[PDB]
Amino acid sequence: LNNIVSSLQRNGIFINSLIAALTIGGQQLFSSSTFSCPCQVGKNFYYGSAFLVIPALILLVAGFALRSQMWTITGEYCPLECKLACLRFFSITGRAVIAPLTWLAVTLLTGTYYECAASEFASVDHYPMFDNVSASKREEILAGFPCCRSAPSDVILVRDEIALLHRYQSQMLGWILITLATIAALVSCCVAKCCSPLTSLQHCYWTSHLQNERELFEQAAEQHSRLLMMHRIKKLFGFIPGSEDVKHIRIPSCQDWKDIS
Amino acid sequence: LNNIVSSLQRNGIFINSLIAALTIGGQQLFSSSTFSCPCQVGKNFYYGSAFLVIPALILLVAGFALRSQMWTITGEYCPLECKLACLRFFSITGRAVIAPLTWLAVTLLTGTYYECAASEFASVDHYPMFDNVSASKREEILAGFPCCRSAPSDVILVRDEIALLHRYQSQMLGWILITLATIAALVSCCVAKCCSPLTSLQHCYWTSHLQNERELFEQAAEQHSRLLMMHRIKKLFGFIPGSEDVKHIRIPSCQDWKDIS
Amino acid sequence: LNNIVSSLQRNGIFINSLIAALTIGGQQLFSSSTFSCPCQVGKNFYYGSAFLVIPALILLVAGFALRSQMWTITGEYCPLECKLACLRFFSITGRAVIAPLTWLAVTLLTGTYYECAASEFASVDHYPMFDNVSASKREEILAGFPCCRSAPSDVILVRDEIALLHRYQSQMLGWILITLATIAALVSCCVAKCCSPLTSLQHCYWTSHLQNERELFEQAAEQHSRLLMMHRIKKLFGFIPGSEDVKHIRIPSCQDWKDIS
Amino acid sequence: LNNIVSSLQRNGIFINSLIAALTIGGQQLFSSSTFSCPCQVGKNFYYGSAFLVIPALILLVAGFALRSQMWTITGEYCPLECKLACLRFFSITGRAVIAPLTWLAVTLLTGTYYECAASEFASVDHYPMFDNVSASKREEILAGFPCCRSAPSDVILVRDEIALLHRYQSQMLGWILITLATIAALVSCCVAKCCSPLTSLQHCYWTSHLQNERELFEQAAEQHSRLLMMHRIKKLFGFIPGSEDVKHIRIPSCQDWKDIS
Amino acid sequence: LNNIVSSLQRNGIFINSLIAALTIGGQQLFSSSTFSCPCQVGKNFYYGSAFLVIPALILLVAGFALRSQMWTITGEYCPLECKLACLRFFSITGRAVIAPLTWLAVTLLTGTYYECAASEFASVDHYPMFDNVSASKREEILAGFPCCRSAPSDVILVRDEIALLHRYQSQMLGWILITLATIAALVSCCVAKCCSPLTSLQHCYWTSHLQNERELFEQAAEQHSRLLMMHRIKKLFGFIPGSEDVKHIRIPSCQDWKDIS
Amino acid sequence: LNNIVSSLQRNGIFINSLIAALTIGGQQLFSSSTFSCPCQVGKNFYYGSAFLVIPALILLVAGFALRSQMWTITGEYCPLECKLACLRFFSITGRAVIAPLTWLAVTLLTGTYYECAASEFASVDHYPMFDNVSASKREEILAGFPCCRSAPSDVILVRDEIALLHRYQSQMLGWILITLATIAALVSCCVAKCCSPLTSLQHCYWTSHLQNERELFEQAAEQHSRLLMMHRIKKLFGFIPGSEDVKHIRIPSCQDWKDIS
Amino acid sequence: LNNIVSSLQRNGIFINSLIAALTIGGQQLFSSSTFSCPCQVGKNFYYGSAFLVIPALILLVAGFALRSQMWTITGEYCPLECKLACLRFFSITGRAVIAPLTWLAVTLLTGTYYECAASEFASVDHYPMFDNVSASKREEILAGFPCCRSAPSDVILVRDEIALLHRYQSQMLGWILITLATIAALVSCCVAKCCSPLTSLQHCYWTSHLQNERELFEQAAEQHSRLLMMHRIKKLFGFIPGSEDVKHIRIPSCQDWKDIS
């Protein structure tokens, strides 16, 4: 049933779902463990922006780089060959895109990252309580109350209202992002089908050709080197390894020990 | 017994039930985790409408796109051929429809999404407490009390009455939607049977023909490419992989290394 | 022992019991989760009537439609042929009837659905407390107290008495319904036996004939199409798939790639 | 060991015990869940009588109807043939009787059903507290206090005494019923043995003859129809299903597609 | 399935992930157990710097040294040979780098190590509370309050603000470090591909050649020495070990006991 | 899979990790159970020094002695032979060093042993509270407060400060020790590779030669003695043990009983 | 894998570790259960001395006696024979020494046994509180307070100080004992290697010779007696046991019954 399991894995839906589930679980643990939104007035946008974009960028780069087909494409690039390379790049891009989109969607829908990032950019014209002719303390309290200030001094109404505003903006932005991602994925698949010179059956043949040629060469390269080394050590020790050699044995010489080395 | 399990899966009832159960569980977790109905006076209908329709639209698109038969139909379209394509589209539409209908039904029956969406569209003529000659504060409180306002000031009677009204309207709308979906499904199946030119036995033969032809070509395309590459690497290394080659081995040349590449 | 398990399933008693148990469990979860009886004076009968009849109607339609034998009967209909079709319809009707009868029986015996449905149709002549010369407030309170009003103002005695009256009427109606269903089932089986032209042994032979003919044609249609496609692709690639083809291989031409497509 | 398990099931004691245990468990759940004895003065005897007799009648009818041997007997009826049919009817009646007797015994021994049924028929001559010259309020309170009235007004002594009287009468009636059932079962078995024209060994032979003839005809009817349809589809597709057919294949014609249909 | 498991391990992604997970778990236990940040005014930077860099340096050295290929490269070093050695060094550097980068990233993101390290380097110009004309007590309290001082004397506002500043700086530094590590890894892989004289297929052949030659020589060196010693002890005891020797046995002499020793 | 498990054990990393883990667990149990730091003014340095060095010395001696290769080296010692013995000593020293280094590192990092050892050597010039012109009570209290004195008399500030000083010194000393151990291990491995006259492949051959020669001689010494004794007892009892001897049996004589003894 | 398990047991390290672990567990249970240090002024040293030395002496005697090789050595004793007997005695002494050393080490390190043993030998010159011109009550209280006296009368400071003194002395004595035991074991092994006339390989041969000769004689003595008795009873009953004897049977005579007895 292992072969049946492998056939099931050959479908990209299961693997992409598994990657998305791992991203969701990892994001839950990571955010609930080590977020600790700072209260710093000077630089607080960088904290949220890093916590929101850097993991997505890392996951994107990992999804692209960890695929050996991408290294082969880059080696080829560094007519029909161009279209074939573009098709392989698209096939890689499927996973390379499902990897970080889950992170961005989950983080935006939770909204805490976006809140901690864009808290300080809130407006104060609507709220008469934020006059603050000093024009410097207002910025500090604006960047301060989202984090840990608490301190109920009847300003918490404005805090709660603006926090709900930023949470709503975050979740709506997440929905916009996921809708755009889905539309882009569908359009990209349609463009790949339209621009592919190979027919559907020819495309299937070519994909299987690529997979099988790579696997076959790997296996037979292993077997060829095994045979060549086995002949070499047959010369070295007077027998082929793993076979009945009580007939004859060899005594290597020091210069022969140099030759094998 | 794995073959028996596969035969059971071949029935669409089990798979559709599994999809519906996953949709119900996912909706429960998603709604109980990250709903957080906003209190914003300006845009609150968009929040509920997005949370109610966007997941359904995404699930519909996923159900249609993830089926490779749909890509084959679109490739063909892009007499009897038209009817056959329509029949295959209907067979895909079965799953493509069971996927989001569960989401819409569960969300409407729970009613919280519809409440948060259409709270602000409530009438005030019936209730004398909502005179509010200002005609602007009334809209804000109307969009505000459903979310988190609480603040018992004896208006909570009107809040509770209108909340029950919207919940009842939501659940009745859900029942109307599921009844219409069932009627449409039954009528569509009857129309498919009436409009199908193939006989019942001929239809069964054609369906099995399609499945078997696709599977057979996939397998033998794999095997043909395996044989062709195996002959190529037999030329390359002087032996066929996976067989007894102690008779002879090859030493590839650099230009030959270019040819295999 | 899998074959023994299949033989046990061939008895309709186990499958009908399994369907009834699933209906009971689903009704328990559904009602205990999302009933929320409304307090609306205008339309409250529709709520309960929908929650009581719509699931039963959906389950009835599903039981009839999900059976492929029903599609075959409808295709035939759209002498002895009429009686044979009627017998097959009855065999389908067995499951199509056990599916929703469990829902109706459980919902009526619990009585909450019937209470929320027919609360507003209660009489007030017996109770002197419901004079209400206004003749409009009385209807509203009558439709209101069953839901969530509570508000002990010594009218709860009338509320409790009428609630017990409606609960008793609901459970007695459920018993009447289940008794009528059992009597109708027994009479229908007796009428089927009386009206069947086939003898008992002939009826058994005919039933097994139908099942076996459908299964055999499905299997051999699969195998015939497999053989035809296998010959086609033998023409295409110069070999039969899944067999030793190191003797010869083919190089398809583009026009031949068109022919296979 | 599955065959040994089947041999154990062939003994009626285990199956009858299993049916009785299921009846006891189902009665426990059903009564502890949805009894809710009403307080209605007018009709309260019908409630208990239905809850006490209707399930027993349904179980009796199910036990008789679900046995296919009963349908065969009814088909025969609709000399020695009469005695043989009577013997088969008795063999069916064994299970048809053990099915509801458990329900009646358990319900009477618990006594709550009988109490709620025959509460209103209690006498009042013994108790001087029930003078009630009105002669209408007395009936209402008599039918009311058993259900949920509580309301300790020092009449609860009479309530408790009459409740104990009805509980004792219920349990004694249950013992009378089970004793009569056992005596009737033993006498019926003795009468069956006396009136049976077959000898003991001949009776065993006849019972096994009946079982084996029915099973054999079912199996070979299946196999005969399989062979006939297999020959038909051999004509249709030019080969027998499930066998090596690479020698020849057929191309059905539309009129031939009509003939197979 | 053990062979399949080995094939999965052959992918570096799983092993690198396993190493990173072990580093994370070990860091969690180690830091939560035995950190105990000191309060010493004189030397407190050394404590955090050691706890932050020494484990990373040890893990780096272990990753490089524990790989026997590194010992082989160092033995060779102590044209194309240089490039081949550089490629092998890079292949080792992959694991040698994933080993401590996890430690540095986790420790910086947690931030406690960096806080305890660079607490004393905080500025005091911004805070008017830290005038301290003594200019020596200020340094001591600055190095003291992060550790365990507590002692709320309304200076804890400055403590909390500067602690948040250092935590934010630590986490941002961790993000900078991980981004630089990823960029360096990608650039190094690209430079390795560009500078490699071998082709992609030739590179695969060479890697498999190296692995197979080392494994083959290890095995056959074992077998050669086994044969040589077996012949020696055949001389010693008059028979080959592990074979039927009831034909003849030997009695070793003391001088022969010296020869074997 | 047992052979695969043995191959995994052949790697020293797993065994060294297992030894270190056992040392950590044993140290945890031992220290948390039976430390009980004394308060004795006279001799308290000896207690901590013993608890810190004696287990390490015992583990070092056990690691060296328990290896039979060490006994063989000592027997040889008691040109190339010297270098070969040095290489074998180094191979033993690997485990002999990983055994106690874990104990020293864990004990120093915990710091309690070092605190109890070097408490009395603390300075008193910095602290004006320790004037104590008596110059004898001061030493006693200095050696006393670390253990169990408690007794808060506002001197606990000095106690806590000096305890933190000694804990920091202990952990820094542990880091210095582990860094020096790692540097020494790496330098020793490099010196072993540089000073080894054998080539890398020759070194592998020699190591496998040593292991195989020892194992082979052990096995065949067992088999030779088994054969010799078996012949002796064949003389004694007239038959070879474990074979069909119903042909003949012997009756030993008393003088023959002496000869076998 | 049982043979592999036996090979692992053949290493003395595992068995000695198992013996030490059992000694530790048994000591824990025994001491925590039934110590109950007495308060008797007269004889309290004997109690602790017995509880500390008698189990060690018993374990030593058991380790020596339970080994049958020791009985063989004593039988031989009761040139090279002397050295061989000494070597076998040393091999026995390994286990005979690891058996009680664990008990002594654990008991001394816990220190409770030594405290209860040597409490009464404490000095009183240092403590001015123990003047007690009576010179008899002082001894009684000195032997009394360690056990159960409690009775805080401000003398508990001296009690605690002297208890810590004796605990420290006990644990230091335990460390001295274990260090001396390890040094003696290493020196004894070195002396055994130096004084052994056999070479290392000859020593291995001799050890295996001893084990194999004893096992072989045991087995074949069993088989010889089985054959002799089997022939005897073949004479007795006319057949060999466990074989086909339907050919002939015997009827033993009473005098023959005497001969077999």
Author numbering:
A (entry chain F), B (entry chain E), C (entry chain D), D (entry chain C), E (entry chain G), F (entry chain H), ...: 5 to 82, 94 to 276
Report text from the authors:
The calcium homeostasis modulators (CALHM) constitute one family of large pore channels that contains six members in humans. Although sharing the same number of membrane-spanning segments, their arrangement is unique and differs from other large pore channels, with an extended helix located on the C-terminus and forming the core of a cytoplasmic domain further mediating subunit interactions. In oligomeric channels, the pore is lined by the first transmembrane segment (TM1) of each subunit, which forms an inner, of two concentric rings, with the outer ring being constituted by TM2-4, with TM2 and 4 of neighboring subunits engaging in extended interactions. Here, we investigated whether these placental paralogs would form heteromers and characterized heteromeric complexes consisting of CALHM2 and CALHM4 subunits using specific binders as fiducial markers.
Dimerization in CALHM4 proceeds at its intracellular region, resulting in large particles, which expose their extracellular parts at both ends of a tubular assembly. This sample has allowed us to isolate a specific binder, termed SbCALHM4 or short SbC4, that forms a tight complex with the CALHM4 channel pair, which remains intact during size exclusion chromatography as confirmed by SDS-PAGE. When investigated by cryo-EM, we observed two populations of particles either exhibiting D10 or D11 symmetry (corresponding to dimers of decameric and undecameric channels) that closely resemble equivalent structures of CALHM4 determined in previous studies. Between the two populations, the reconstruction of the density with D10 symmetry imposed was of higher resolution and we thus restrict our detailed analysis to this structure. Each subunit contains four membrane-spanning helices, three of which (TM2-4) are tightly interacting to form an outer ring with a large diameter that separates the inside of the pore from its surrounding membrane environment. In contrast, TM1 forms an inner ring of helices lining the pore, with the bent helical N-terminus (NH) running perpendicular to the membrane and projecting towards the pore axis. TM1 packs against TM3 of the outer ring but is not involved in direct subunit interactions. Within each channel, we find residual density of low resolution, whose distribution resembles the headgroup region of a lipid bilayer, which was thus previously ascribed to a membrane assembled in the lumen of the pore. In this cryo-EM map, we find the density of sybodies binding at the extracellular side of each subunit forming two rings of binders at both ends of the assembly.
